[PDB]
Amino acid sequence: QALQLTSYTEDMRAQGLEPTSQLLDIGYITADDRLAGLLDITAGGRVLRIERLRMANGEPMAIETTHLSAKRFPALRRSLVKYTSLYTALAEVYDVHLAEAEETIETSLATPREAGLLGTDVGLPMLMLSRHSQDRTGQPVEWVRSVYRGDRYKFVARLKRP
Amino acid sequence: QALQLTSYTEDMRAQGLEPTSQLLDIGYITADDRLAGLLDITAGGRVLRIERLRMANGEPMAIETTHLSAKRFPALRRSLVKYTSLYTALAEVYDVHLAEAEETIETSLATPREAGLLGTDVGLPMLMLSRHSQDRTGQPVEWVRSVYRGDRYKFVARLKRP
């Protein structure tokens, strides 16, 4: 609670590595109840889904899948090409800024496709990150699910106790 | 950065589960340079090592191995039986209180012994937590290494961005 909401780029530089990305896929899907609840939209609502391959020192590091309300951000898909960053896009196009988020850390095995994209096998433990962010108006902005190579990644938290 | 320094008990209750423990082993070891640096003691220095089996809902959940300066806490081993908690012991016997800590999250496979103690196999992804704590006088107090069952555990962080 009350930790530092750091995006992918900073968490890599705060770890020595040089971050880069590659869009794998982008498109609209239909929200089931679970996703609808997380984005505060109605079930059946349209969701923009972005899938990116994250790299560091040139090699595959993570697959990052971001979900957002298409209804709220109907021109975001088109605008994303203009930008280096989803969050730049949200700030400049929609004046939306992340304020707070709940991050979940788990470990799991990769799917066959994931293993292929990350140059690992399906027996390597992977770090699974989920992130549920809200904006400065206290609305949910995104639900993010990422799979990190377990041999190459660690996540560091600085904790304090009052 | 600036997250909430939560001990094992709170992190379980903030997750629905009912926490219990069992001492597996306790004793002194000699610090190698790496450990000596973390506890701010001289290489060769004596370290109190505590190994505990953590349980929740009755079943095995984590193995938690804590290291402390024996020189600084020479009567801690003996005093630990009187107490429900290492941190109660440190507060009451030595007036030492955790103030800040660096926590590392990783995933790895269990050793054969670990797998046996946790009723899992060595193919299950495990969550590896390291914790390096300092006290209210800004000195290092502990270095902790824990292995959590990957099928049963998640770690939740609440992040903010100024």
Which residue of A5, A153, A160 is in closest CB contact with B159? A5
The tokens for B85 are 């908690």
> What's the Cα-to-Cα distance from B56 to each of B17, B109, B149, rounded to whole Å?
6, 21, 11
Q: Which residue of B has its CA nearest to A133?
A: B159
Domain carrying residue A97: 1-162
Q: Solved how?
A: X-ray
Which residues of A touch chain B, with CB atoms under 8 Å apart?
Answer: 1-6, 98-109, 123, 125-127, 150, 153-161
> Amino acid letter at A109?
L
Q: Is A51 exposed, middle or buried (0-12, 13-18, 19+ CB in 10 A)?
A: middle
Bridge-based pairing of strands B3-4 and A155-160 is: parallel
Matching residue, tokens 């770690």: B155
For residue B159, the chain A residues in CB contact (below 8 A) are 3-6, 100-103
Count of the separate structural domains present in chain A: 1
The CATH number given to whatever domain includes residue A110 is: 3.40.1410.10
Q: Cβ neighbours of residue B55 under 8 Å, at least 6 residues apart?
A: B19, B20, B21, B22, B61
B5/A161 Cβ within 8 A: yes
Which residue of B5, B104, B150 is in closest CB contact with A154? B104
Q: How many angstroms away from the CA of A38 is the closest CA of chain B?
A: 16
List own/partner pairs for A95-100 with CB under 8 A and 24 or more apart.
A96/A135, A96/A136, A96/A141, A97/A135, A97/A136, A98/A5, A98/A133, A98/A134, A98/A135, A98/A141, A98/B161, A99/A134, A99/A135, A99/A136, A99/A138, A99/B160, A99/B161, A100/A5, A100/A133, A100/A134, A100/B158, A100/B159, A100/B160, A100/B161
* Distance between CA atoms of residues B124 and B151, nearest Å: 8
Three-class secondary structure assignment of chain B: CCEECCCHHHHHHCCCCCEEEEEEEEEEEECCHHHHHHHCCCCCCEEEEEEEEEEECCEEEEEEEEEEECCCCCCHHHHHHHCCCHHHHHHHHHCCCEEEEEEEEEEECCCHHHHHHCCCCCCCCEEEEEEEEEECCCCEEEEEEEEEECCCCCEEEEEECC
A157/B102 Cβ within 8 A: yes
> What's the Cα-to-Cα distance from B108 to each of A127, A146, A149, B14, B123, rounded to whole Å?
10, 18, 11, 25, 10
A155/B104 Cβ within 8 A: yes
Beta strands in A13-125 (DSSP E): 19-30, 46-56, 59-69, 98-108
Are A28 and A47 in contact by the 8 Å Cβ rule? The answer is yes
Q: Which residue of A has its CA nearest to B150?
A: A107
A156/B105 Cβ within 8 A: yes
* Distance between CA atoms of residues A41 and A46, nearest Å: 9
Matching residue, tokens 């304020």: A99
**Among the listed residues A72, A66, A81, A87, the one whose alpha carbon sits nearest the alpha carbon of residue A6:** A87
Q: How many angstroms away from the CA of B122 is the closest CA of chain A?
A: 11
The secondary element (H helix, E strand) that includes residue A91 is helix A86-94
Are B159 and A10 in contact by the 8 Å Cβ rule? The answer is no
Measured between its terminal Cα atoms, the distance across chain A in Å is: 12
> Amino acid letter at A32?
D
B102/A159 Cβ within 8 A: yes
* Distance between CA atoms of residues A39 and A49, nearest Å: 12
C-alpha of B126 from chain center: 15
Matching residue, tokens 């081993």: B77
* Distance between CA atoms of residues A104 and B153, nearest Å: 10
Tell me if residue A142 falls in helix, strand or coil: strand
